[PDB]
């Protein structure tokens, strides 16, 4: 009974802690790559090329 609730609390605490660590790692990894993607890998396809043959 009550011991089982304690086991549930402990397991859930473990899940919360590992998710905390995972989220921190994800943010730390993403932020530099986030900058990389955001600043100067952005492009715009203004045109598309077409042979004069079909026109």
């Amino acid at each position: 009974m009550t011991d089982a609730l304690e086991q549930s609390v402990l397991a859930l605490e473990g899940t919360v802690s590992v998710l905390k660590d995972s989220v921190e790692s994800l943010k730390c990894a993403n932020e530099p790559s986030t900058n990389l993607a955001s600043t100067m890998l952005q492009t715009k396809r203004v045109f598309r090329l077409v042979p004069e043959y079909d026109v």
Binding site: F47, R48, P51
Partner: peptide, 10 residues
């Protein structure tokens, strides 16, 4: 090479 026309697509 077969001459290309540039068509705006934006």
């Amino acid at each position: 090479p077969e001459t290309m026309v540039r068509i705006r697509v934006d």
